[PDB]
């Protein structure tokens, strides 16, 4: 259901994801990898929010930044655009 109402964020999302898929079109492994990372983070965040309160996630924002950083070498540009999405943590 979301909460936002600005169609600009959506456009930016597709542009970024498309940029990665195109930049790494040669190696589908990298693309699938990044996706799996985000998916895992989602399941973890939801689990915590569904656990009520008493729960310790194994994958957080900082953890994701570290993993994505190691997998994305010499490509700080993408890692930056990705970090921008993350709020003030």
């Amino acid at each position: 259901s979301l909460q936002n109402n600005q169609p600009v964020e959506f456009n930016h999302a597709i542009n970024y994801v498309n940029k990665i898929k195109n930049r790494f079109q040669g190696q589908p492994d990298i693309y699938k990898a990044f996706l799996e990372i985000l998916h895992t983070y989602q399941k973890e965040q939801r689990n915590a929010k569904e656990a009520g309160g008493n729960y310790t996630p194994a994958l957080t924002e900082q953890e994701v930044y570290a993993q994505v950083a190691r997998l994305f070498k010499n490509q700080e540009d993408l890692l930056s655009e990705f970090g921008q999405f993350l709020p003030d943590a």
Partner: peptide
């Protein structure tokens, strides 16, 4: 929520 869930739906959209 706009940080990860957004990019998730986007990828799932273009993909299928």
């Amino acid at each position: 929520r706009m940080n990860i869930q957004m990019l998730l739906e986007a990828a799932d959209y273009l993909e299928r």
